[PDB]
Nucleic acid binder design. Structure first.
Lengths: 266, 69, 119, 155
RNA sequence: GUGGGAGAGGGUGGUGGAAUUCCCGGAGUAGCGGUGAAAUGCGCAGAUACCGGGAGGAACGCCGAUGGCGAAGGCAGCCACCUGGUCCACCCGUGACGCUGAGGCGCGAAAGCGUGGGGAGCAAACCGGAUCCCGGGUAGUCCACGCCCUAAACGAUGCGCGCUAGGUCUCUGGGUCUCCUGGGGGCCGAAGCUAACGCGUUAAGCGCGCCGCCUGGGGAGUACGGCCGCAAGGCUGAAACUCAAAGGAAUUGACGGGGGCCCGCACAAGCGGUGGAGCAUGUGGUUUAAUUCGAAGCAACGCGAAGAACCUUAC
RNA sequence: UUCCCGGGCCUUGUACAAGCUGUACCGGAAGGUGCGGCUGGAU
C-alpha cells in the first residue's frame, strides 16, 4: 500500500527542504502514484523512478507520459549499482540526489546500501516513522541513540527537517511520520580506523544496551574474557570508565577506543 | 451414587487406611471432585491433604493408566 | 525370527505424524512403521486413512515374524487414535489389553508460544 | 423444500397388466412425450421375453428389478473443506428410482440396433443377476461399507 | 485475660513424583519435525518411535471453586521450626487509654542495574527459512546480597464510627441445632441517591471527624530549578502559544471480524440445456468518408430498434 | 440444511451520523516482539 498524499504543497515543502532545482536531477526510488515524480519532473531536468515490479509500470503510462524528463528504468533497487545508471542516464545532470516514497517498511536496507556504495552525490531526503527517523537526529545519549545512529553519522551528517501528522496519509498510519535530510560527508567523520572491527565494536557495545560498557565488551566481543584486563587497560588510556554505558559515549571516542583495542588483541 | 454414601464411620486424617482411601481416586490415581465424593469443603480439603501425604509414603499412586480405549 | 508370537504395540499419535512400534515382551523394539514408510507427505500424514494403512502394514510385517496377540499401548492425541485402534483390533491380532498412556506433565516446564493462554 | 416433506405422485396402474411399476419403467424410457413409442417398445420387449422364455414376463420384471435394487448408498458431506462419503441406507422409493434409472440407461448403451432388442437382453441379463445395471449396483454397493471409518458422520 | 477455630499469610531447613533436555547401553531402521502450502533444520558416525540406567535446572497435574489468607503488591507438592494478622465463647480485668494523620520511616507485580554463581525448558535483540508464520538463539526468566522503585498498583470507589426493608446462595465459628446468633465472600432488590448506566447493611443512601486531590482541551507530565539513582529513569512541576470546543452516559439509525433463528429450483434429488461445431443477432475493440447516439455487474448485450435497398437517419 | 447465493426478524460492538497499559529492545518499524497486568473485550 501507498500513503495517499491528499494534502497539497507538502510535496513542494519536502522539495524546498531538499533544495532540488533545475540544475539538479534527482533519483526517485519508488514511483508510487507519480505525484512526487510529477513535481520532480516539473522543476528538474531529469528524474528517474526505479521499478521493481513491471506490473506497476503501466500507471505512469498516462501520468508521467505528459512529462518528458522522466526516464523509466526497470531494475531492482537492491540488485543494482546506482553509479552506472547515474553515469549513463544522468551524464547531463549536475547535482545527484535522491527523493524516496518507500512504505516506511523497506527504507532502512535501501538507505544503508546507498551509503555502502560510497556513491558521490548531494544527498537523500526521505519520509518514515518518527521513532525510526535515523532514530531521530540522535546524539551520544538518550533512548534514540543506537548503532544505526553511529553508522549513519559516520558516513554522513544528519538532520530531521519536518514532522508530518495524520490526515496527510489516507490509510491512516496510526503512527506519525517525519522527513529527514542526509548530505554525504567528504569521506569519514572519523579520522582513521579499520571499518570492519570498528563496526563490530559498535555492534558489540550496544548488544545488551542496559548493561555497562565493560560487561558489553567482555560478553559480546569474541573471546574477551581472557583478555579482559587488556580491555580495561585501554579504557584507562582512552580516558573512558567502564561504568558509562555505550549510549553515553560519542562516535569519535568510539573510534579512539577502536584504534586502541585494534592494536591490543586483534 | 457417591463415595461417602457407600462407607461407614472412619477417620479422614489416617494416612494409612488405603482400603478406604483408594476409593476416593478415579481409574487413574486422581482425586475425585465433590460431585463424585460428596463431601463438604472442610472434609474434602483434609482428605486431599491426607491423600497427598499417603502418595508420598508410596501407599497410593501418583498417577495410573485407565484400562479403556 | 523372534517368533515370540506375542508383543506390545506403542502407537505414537501426533497431530502431524502417526508412528506404530511393535516390540517384544521385554520392551526391545521389533519393528516400526510411520507415515513416511507409506510415502505420504505434508499435512495429510495426520489424516486417519494414512494411520490405518500404517497399522495394517505393521500388522502384516508382524505376522511375518510370528505375531499372534499383542498389548496396544496408545500414546499421544493424534487425529487417528480410535481409527488405528479399530484397524489393528480387527487386523487379525488377538489383542488383549488396550490402555491410554498419554504422558502429561505435572506442571513442569513452560510450553512453547502456541500452547500458552491456559485457563 | 424447507417446510414440506414433499408428497409423492401416485402413478396410474398399467392398462394391460394392471400394475404401476411397468408405468414407472415406461415413463423412465419415455422421452419428448413419446409415451406411445415407449409403450410399444416395452411391449415388444414383453413379446421378446415371452417368446424366448416360457414364463410370464411380470414375475421377471419384479425379480430383475430386485436384482438391480441398491441397498447401501454413499452421500457427500462437507466437513472443514473436506469430503466425507458416508454410506447410508436407501428408502424403497429411492431403491426403485435408482433401479429403473440404471436399468434403462444400461439398456440404451447396448451394442444392438433395435431398442426393443436392447432393452429385452438388458432385462433378461438383469434377471439372471449379471448386467450393466447389476454391475453398477454392486459397484456402488462395494463403494459403500468401505468408508466405515467415516460412518460416524450421520449427515 | 481464659478456651478454642479456619487459612496458597511470611521466613528458614529438608525431600516427592510426573514431564522436558542431555550422556550411556540393550535392541532396532529410513526418514523425523513443521504450517494455511511447505520450506529451513536433524538423521546412514544410525536419527525418530522403544526399554533400562544416570546428570541436572525450573514449575508443582487431579484436588480447585463461582473457594481461602494478606494492608497492598501478592500467595498453592509435601514435612518440620520460628513468626505476623484475625474470628468466636465466658463477660473475668483496666477505665476514654480513642479516630485520622502533612513530613519521616518501612513494604512495593513485571521489567531494568551492580557483584558472584546457575542455566532444563521458554524466549527481546540477532541469524536463517516460505510469503503475520516456522526453525535456531545471547540477555533475561533462577538463586544470594545490594539497587531501581513504576502500572488498566482497579472495586477506576481514603480510613473510622452510628442509623435505614428484606429474599437467596456460599465459606468459617457458637448454641437449646434444618431454628436461632457472630464474622467474611457473591446475586436480586425497600426507602433513598445518580446526568444516565447503575449503587443499594460489602451504599455510590442519611450524618459526624481527619487526610489527599480537582478547576476547559492541546502544548505536557514537556522545559527549567531542586532532591533521589551507577544508568535507565523517578519525584516535584510551569509558561509562551493555539482551538471553541474536549468529554460522560444514554436514544434512534446503518455497518462489521459478530453469533442465533426463518425462508426463496438457494443448495440438495432429477430432467433438459448453451460452454465444443456450422449459422442469426447483439455488443467491446479493429477498420474506414462515416462504419452516428444512448445502455456496462446482477438490474447493459435478439435492450431503445414492435421490420435500415431510397426513405428511416440522427453519420 | 451439509454447504453456497440473496433476503427477513433478533442479539451484540471496534468505528461512525480484540483493545489498552508499565518497563526493555529493534542495521524488514502503516510498527513488531519479549515479561507481566487490566476489561474500559465474545466463548
Amino acid at each position: 500500500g501507498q500513503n495517499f498524499l491528499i494534502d497539497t504543497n507538502i510535496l513542494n515543502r519536502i522539495v524546498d527542504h531538499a533544495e532540488v532545482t533545475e540544475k539538479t536531477g534527482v533519483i526517485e526510488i519508488g514511483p508510487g502514484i507519480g505525484a512526487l515524480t510529477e513535481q520532480l519532473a516539473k522543476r528538474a531536468k531529469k528524474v528517474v523512478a526505479f521499478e521493481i515490479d513491471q506490473r506497476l509500470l503501466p500507471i505512469l503510462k498516462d501520468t508521467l507520459s505528459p512529462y518528458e524528463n522522466v526516464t523509466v528504468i526497470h531494475q531492482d533497487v537492491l540488485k543494482a549499482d546506482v553509479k552506472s545508471v547515474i553515469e549513463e542516464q544522468f551524464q547531463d545532470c549536475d547535482e545527484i540526489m535522491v527523493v524516496a516514497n518507500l512504505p516506511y517498511y523497506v527504507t532502512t536496507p535501501i538507505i544503508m546500501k546507498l551509503l555502502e556504495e560510497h556513491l558521490p552525490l548531494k544527498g537523500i531526503v526521505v519520509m518514515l516513522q518518527k521513532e525510526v527517523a535515523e532514530r531521530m537526529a540522535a546524539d551520544p545519549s538518550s533512548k534514540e541513540y543506537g548503532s544505526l545512529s553511529i553508522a549513519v553519522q559516520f558516513y554522513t551528517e544528519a538532520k530531521t527537517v519536518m514532522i508530518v501528522p495524520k490526515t496527510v496519509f489516507v490509510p491512516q498510519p496510526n503512527v506519525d511520520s517525519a522527513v529527514i535530510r542526509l548530505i554525504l560527508r567528504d569521506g569519514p567523520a572519523v579520522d582513521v580506523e579499520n571499518e570492519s572491527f570498528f563496526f563490530q565494536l559498535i555492534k558489540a557495545s550496544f548488544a545488551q544496551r542496559r548493561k555497562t560498557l565493560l560487561n558489553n565488551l567482555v560478553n559480546n566481543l569474541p573471546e574477551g574474557k581472557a583478555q579482559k584486563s587488556t580491555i580495561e587497560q585501554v579504557l584507562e588510556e582512552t580516558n573512558i570508565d567502564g561504568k558509562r554505558r555505550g549510549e553515553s559515549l560519542s562516535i569519535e571516542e568510539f573510534a579512539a577506543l577502536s584504534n586502541g583495542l585494534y592494536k591490543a588483541l586483534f | 451414587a457417591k463415595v461417602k454414601a457407600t462407607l461407614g464411620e472412619f477417620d479422614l486424617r489416617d494416612y494409612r487406611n488405603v482400603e478406604v482411601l483408594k476409593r476416593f481416586l478415579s481409574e487413574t490415581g486422581k482425586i475425585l471432585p465433590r460431585r463424585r465424593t460428596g463431601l463438604s469443603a472442610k472434609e474434602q480439603r483434609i482428605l486431599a491433604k491426607t491423600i497427598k501425604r499417603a502418595r508420598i509414603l508410596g501407599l497410593l499412586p501418583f498417577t495410573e493408566k485407565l484400562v479403556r480405549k | 525370527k523372534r517368533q515370540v508370537a506375542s508383543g506390545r504395540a506403542y502407537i505414537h499419535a501426533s497431530y502431524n505424524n502417526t508412528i506404530v512400534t511393535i516390540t517384544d515382551p521385554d520392551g526391545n523394539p521389533i519393528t516400526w512403521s510411520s507415515g513416511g514408510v507409506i510415502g505420504y507427505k505434508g499435512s495429510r500424514k495426520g489424516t486417519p486413512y494414512a494411520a490405518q494403512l500404517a497399522a495394517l502394514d505393521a500388522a502384516k510385517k508382524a505376522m511375518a515374524y510370528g505375531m499372534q496377540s499383542v498389548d496396544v499401548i496408545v500414546r499421544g492425541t493424534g487425529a487417528g487414535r480410535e481409527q488405528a485402534i479399530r484397524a489393528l483390533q480387527a487386523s487379525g491380532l488377538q489383542v488383549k489389553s488396550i490402555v491410554d498412556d498419554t504422558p502429561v506433565p505435572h506442571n513442569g516446564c513452560r510450553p512453547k508460544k502456541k500452547f500458552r493462554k491456559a485457563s | 423444500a424447507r417446510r414440506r416433506r414433499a408428497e409423492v405422485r401416485q402413478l396410474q396402474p398399467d392398462l394391460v397388466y394392471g400394475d404401476v411399476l411397468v408405468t414407472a419403467f415406461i415413463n423412465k424410457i419415455m422421452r419428448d412425450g413419446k409415451k406411445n413409442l415407449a409403450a410399444r417398445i416395452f411391449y415388444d420387449a414383453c413379446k421378446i421375453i415371452q417368446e424366448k422364455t416360457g414364463q410370464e414376463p411380470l414375475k421377471v420384471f419384479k425379480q430383475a428389478v430386485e436384482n438391480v435394487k441398491p441397498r447401501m448408498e454413499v452421500r457427500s458431506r462437507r466437513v472443514g473443506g473436506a469430503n466425507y462419503q458416508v454410506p447410508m441406507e436407501v428408502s424403497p422409493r429411492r431403491q426403485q428410482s435408482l433401479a429403473l434409472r440404471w436399468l434403462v440407461q444400461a439398456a440404451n448403451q447396448r451394442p444392438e440396433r433395435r431398442a426393443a432388442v436392447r432393452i429385452a437382453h438388458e432385462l433378461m441379463d438383469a434377471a439372471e443377476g449379471k448386467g450393466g445395471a447389476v454391475k453398477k449396483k454392486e459397484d456402488v454397493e462395494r463403494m459403500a461399507e468401505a468408508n466405515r471409518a467415516y460412518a460416524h458422520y450421520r449427515w
